[PDB]
């Protein structure tokens, strides 16, 4: 399906460059909890909501990349001459992010030292999300509409990216300051967002089609919600609340 | 910006008591969840106690549960660490702590200079 | 899953113009017309050397340095056939020519890491 070798290699390069930028951020907090043997400063509510965001994106990537049954439903849907919009680096990212989120969740349990349980309202959201996904599973099952089910997981991942960014931007607006700002972590999130979009743009200009942006709408919105909020964070840090 | 000033600590003999204090500046203590931490020489910082944002709910490290007590005087903007039944184990620079809890991305920890509490057998 | 049959020729002379063909068959989730195809030559003793490849859109044609500006590759997205038009041949071009096809990667195919390969058909260029 890849027509151009330079475009394919630049797609593969931009792919692992997006993977590295978003996967390396998981380590500084992981190591900090380890050195301390405590999770006092951690928002437990956010770690449980990011597990749902990561596992839903992981469901979609692992299934579309490895299942030929689901892939055939993608061609039946977006077109026979369509390239699958899941990359090796997207699969690697989703699995690595699920592993790292499970490790920090394990650190919260074994290291404890976090009386601030936080756990409430956000627990109801996990119940509502996984409940709505369970109903969706039983709807999809008789017809084996695994592409529609995988597609719900990718849409709930989108909602969950908003859940990552919106409370932290809202906090900065009420607070009238950017507390916890790090030009480095924002630039790593930014690179991963631009590179995840440049990957789709390369797949789209290699083939003469934009259907990959519609097939993997969840990855398209994952990059655009990251880029929008990084511009907004940089905007409220330098021109709004600087000092 | 925000300043923390600990005082009350010094040398005491095993079995004694101390009333550590913390003078908050830049923020109300009744609005924030206040913490106490300790650091023994060479060993890493250890969270010791906490008092809820708008209430009297408290939490302590298992090493001090039953001996230490955290309270706050609203009419003084200060947090206290009434530490009874002291042991030479408890020797450390005690820091009162407040933070700017941050949903995703790094929480900002505010510290005082600390007060050395030395307990001798 | 996919069978590749090289319907090529045999013996030609130094400075001749031979022409290989390659039909692709089999039932697959991908159209086979979108499948990236190419050629490789074996040679007595030496390992699989790349010769040429054509994109599924048939626009991009890659050629090895050795054959570049001598061989030409053409596709037939309808018959699923690749053609190696080996013009102005040299005695050093005598080898078994393998047809190759990859459902997804052009890079994999170019590097000898393709999924599918043909029987191979001997091309004898004699001085």
Task: Kindly list the domain boundaries of chain A, sorted by start residue.
Answer: 5-237
Please tell me the number of Cα atoms within 13 Å of A197 on its side-chain side: 14
Residue B69, beta-bridge partner list: B82
Burial of A39 (0-12, 13-18, 19+ CB in 10 A): buried
* Residue A102 and residue A29 in contact, taking contact as beta carbons nearer than 8 Å: no
C58 closest CA partner among C35, C39, C41, C40: C35
Task: Note whether B107 contacts A180, CB cutoff 8 Å.
Answer: yes
Task: Kindly state which CATH superfamily the domain B3-119 is placed in.
Answer: Immunoglobulins (2.60.40.10)
C39 closest CA partner among C104, C123, C124: C123
* Residue A12 and residue C69 in contact, taking contact as beta carbons nearer than 8 Å: no
Task: Note whether A115 contacts B50, CB cutoff 8 Å.
Answer: yes
* Residue A166 structure tokens: 């919106």
A198 closest CA partner among A224, A231, A235: A224
Burial of A101 (0-12, 13-18, 19+ CB in 10 A): buried
CA distances from residue C103 to A14, A84, A181, C31, C114 in whole angstroms, order as listed? 22, 12, 46, 9, 9
- For B20, phi then psi, to 5°, come to -80, 145
Q: How far apart are CA B78 and CA B3, in angstroms?
A: 12
Please tell me the number of Cα atoms within 13 Å of A38 on its side-chain side: 14
* Per-residue exposure over A165-200, b if at least 16 CB sit within 10 Å of its own CB, e if not: bebbeebbeeeebbbbbeeebbebbbbbbbbbbbbb
Interface of C with A (CB under 8 A): 29-31, 33-36, 55-57, 59-60, 62, 103-107, 110
Q: Which residues of C touch A4 (CB under 8 A)?
A: 55, 60, 106
Task: Note whether A185 contacts B107, CB cutoff 8 Å.
Answer: no
Q: Convert chain C into a string of H (helix), E (strand) and C (coil).
A: CCEEEECCCCEEECCCCEEEEEEEECCCCCCCCCCCEEEEECCCCCCCEEEEEECCCCCCEEECCCCCCCEEEEEECCCCEEEEEECCCCHHHCEEEEEEECCCCHHHHHCCCCCEECCCEEEEEEC
Within 10 angstroms of residue C71's Cβ, the number of other Cβ atoms is 22
Expressed in Å, this structure's resolution amounts to: 2.7
Please report all neighbours of B, defined by 3+ CB atom pairs within 8 A: A
Chain A closest-CA separation from residue B27 CA (Å):
13
* Residue A218 structure tokens: 């969840």
Residue of A nearest to B62 (CA): A113
Q: How far apart are CA B95 and CA B107, in angstroms?
A: 17
Within 10 angstroms of residue A210's Cβ, the number of other Cβ atoms is 13
* Residue appearing with tokens 């010769």: C51
Task: Note whether C106 contacts A9, CB cutoff 8 Å.
Answer: no
Q: What residues contact residue B41 under an 8 Å CB cut-off, 6+ apart?
A: none
Q: Which residues of C touch A71 (CB under 8 A)?
A: 29
Residue of C nearest to A3 (CA): C55
* Residue C35 and residue C17 in contact, taking contact as beta carbons nearer than 8 Å: no
Interface of B with A (CB under 8 A): 33, 35, 44-45, 47, 50, 59, 61, 99-109
Q: Do chains C and B touch (3 or more CB pairs under 8 A)?
A: no
Q: How far apart are CA B61 and CA B63, in angstroms?
A: 5
Q: What residues contact residue A17 under an 8 Å CB cut-off, 6+ apart?
A: A191, A195
Which of B104, B108, B109, B110 has the highest number of chain A CBs within 10 A, making it the mutation to test binding with A? B104
- For B100, phi then psi, to 5°, come to -110, 90
Task: Note whether B104 contacts A116, CB cutoff 8 Å.
Answer: no
B101 closest CA partner among A196, A129, A40: A40
* Residue appearing with tokens 């507390």: A179
Q: Convert B59-102 into a string of H (helix), E (strand) and C (coil).
A: EECCCCECCEEEEEEHHHCEEEEEECCCCHHHCEEEEEEEEECC
* Residue C40 and residue C49 in contact, taking contact as beta carbons nearer than 8 Å: yes
* Residue A222 structure tokens: 């994952």
Interface of A with C (CB under 8 A): 1-5, 8-9, 12, 68, 71-72, 75, 80-81, 207-208
Please report all neighbours of A, defined by 3+ CB atom pairs within 8 A: B, C
B35 closest CA partner among B83, B94, B98: B98
* Residue appearing with tokens 């408890």: B90
* Residue B60 structure tokens: 């302590």
CA distances from residue C91 to B58, C52, C57, C63, C127 in whole angstroms, order as listed? 90, 18, 33, 19, 6
C119 closest CA partner among C101, C96, C102, C93: C96
Q: How far apart are CA B71 and CA B79, in angstroms?
A: 6
* Residue A94 and residue A57 in contact, taking contact as beta carbons nearer than 8 Å: yes
* Residue A154 structure tokens: 């990718």
Q: Which residues of A touch C33 (CB under 8 A)?
A: 81
Which of A41, A54, A186 has the highest number of chain B CBs within 10 A, making it the mutation to test binding with B? A41
* Residue A33 structure tokens: 């909890």
Q: Name which CATH class applies to C3-125.
A: mainly beta
Residue B98, beta-bridge partner list: B110
Helix ranges restricted to H, chain A:
5-23, 26-36, 44-66, 68-78, 88-110, 122-140, 146-175, 185-206, 212-215, 217-238
* Residue C62 and residue C52 in contact, taking contact as beta carbons nearer than 8 Å: yes
Please report all neighbours of C, defined by 3+ CB atom pairs within 8 A: A
Q: How far apart are CA A123 and CA A44, in angstroms?
A: 10
Which of A179, A225, A233, A234 has the highest number of chain B CBs within 10 A, making it the mutation to test binding with B? A179
* Residue B91 and residue B118 in contact, taking contact as beta carbons nearer than 8 Å: yes
Task: Note whether A2 contacts C31, CB cutoff 8 Å.
Answer: no
* Residue C94 and residue C124 in contact, taking contact as beta carbons nearer than 8 Å: yes
Point out the residue among C30, C103, C106 whose CB comes nearest to the CB of A8.
C106
* Residue A138 structure tokens: 């039983």
Q: How far apart are CA A64 and CA A60, in angstroms?
A: 6
Q: How far apart are CA A177 and CA A152, in angstroms?
A: 36
Task: Note whether A1 contacts C104, CB cutoff 8 Å.
Answer: yes
Chain pair A-C, CB pairs under 8 angstroms: 44
* Residue appearing with tokens 């309270």: B71
Q: How far apart are CA C99 and CA C35, in angstroms?
A: 13
* Per-residue exposure over A4-17, b if at least 16 CB sit within 10 Å of its own CB, e if not: bbebbeebbebbbb
């Amino acid at each position: 399906s890849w027509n151009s070798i330079p475009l394919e290699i630049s797609y593969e390069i931009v792919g692992w460059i997006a993977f590295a930028s978003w996967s390396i951020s998981f380590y500084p907090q992981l190591i900090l909890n380890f050195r301390r043997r405590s999770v006092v400063g951690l928002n437990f509510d956010f770690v449980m909501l990011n597990l749902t965001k990561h596992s839903s994106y992981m469901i979609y990537n692992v299934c579309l990349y490895f299942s030929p049954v689901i892939q055939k439903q993608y061609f039946d849907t977006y077109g026979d001459k369509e390239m699958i919009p899941v990359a090796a680096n997207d699969v690697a990212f989703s699995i690595h992010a699920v592993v790292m989120t499970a490790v920090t969740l394990f650190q919260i349990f074994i290291y404890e030292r976090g009386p601030q349980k936080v756990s409430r309202l956000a627990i109801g959201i996990v119940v509502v999300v996984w409940g709505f996904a369970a109903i969706c599973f039983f709807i999809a099952l008789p017809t084996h509409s695994w592409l529609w089910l995988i597609s719900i997981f990718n849409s709930i991942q989108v909602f969950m990216t908003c859940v990552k960014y919106i409370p932290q931007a809202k906090m900065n607006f009420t607070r009238k300051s950017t507390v916890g700002w790090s030009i480095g972590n924002i630039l790593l999130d930014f690179t991963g967002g631009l590179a995840n979009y440049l990957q789709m743009v390369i797949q789209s200009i290699d083939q003469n089609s934009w259907k990959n942006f519609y097939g993997n709408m969840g990855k398209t919105l994952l990059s655009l919600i990251s880029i929008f909020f990084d511009i907004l964070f940089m905007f409220q840090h330098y021109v709004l609340y600087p000092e | 910006q925000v300043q923390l000033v600990e005082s009350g600590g010094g040398l005491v003999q095993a079995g004694g008591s101390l009333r550590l204090s913390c003078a908050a500046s830049g923020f109300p203590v009744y609005r924030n969840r206040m913490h106490w931490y300790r650091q023994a020489p060479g060993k890493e910082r250890e969270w010791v106690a906490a008092i809820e944002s708008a209430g009297q709910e408290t939490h302590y490290a298992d090493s001090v549960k039953g001996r230490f007590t955290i309270s706050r005087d609203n009419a003084k903007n200060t947090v206290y660490l009434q530490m009874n039944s002291l042991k030479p184990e408890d020797t450390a620079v005690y820091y009162c702590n407040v933070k700017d809890e941050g949903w995703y991305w790094q929480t900002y920890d505010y510290w005082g200079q600390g007060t050395q509490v030395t307990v001798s057998a």
